[PDB]
């Protein structure tokens, strides 16, 4: 599963979850790491902390960039065992995929 769940455990994952959305209404917290079998680079930054109306195509367009892809290179967010399409916005995303340390985790691969 995600490094980030590994390296805190879940009562304090779910404090700062709760502190962002209260902090920042119009954000949607977001976890993003590489998927376990993804053959691409790895980002530094793995909190996000993006507007809610951001759709999944924007946030690709970031992604993509972020880790040297071209346009045209194959990339796919998975979250929650689905594959959103990239007309939703990440605050749906959010509040159909949050998990209940309210975090977003989505996976990026190739």
Do not use: C, W
């Not at 700062?16 to 680079?41: L, S, T």
């Not at 951001?54 to 594959?83: M, S």
Request: hydrophobic fraction near 30%.
């Amino acid at each position: 599963g995600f490094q980030y769940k590994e390296d805190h455990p879940f009562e304090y994952r779910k404090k700062e979850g709760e502190k962002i959305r209260k902090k920042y209404p119009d954000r949607v917290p977001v976890i993003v790491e590489k998927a376990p079998k993804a053959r691409v680079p790895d980002l530094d930054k793995r909190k996000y902390l993006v507007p809610s109306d951001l759709t999944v195509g924007q946030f690709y367009f970031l992604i993509r960039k972020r880790i040297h892809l071209r346009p045209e290179d194959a990339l796919f967010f998975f979250v929650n065992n689905t594959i959103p399409p990239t007309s939703a916005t990440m605050g749906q995303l959010y509040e159909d995929n949050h998990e209940e340390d309210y975090f977003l985790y989505v996976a990026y691969s190739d």
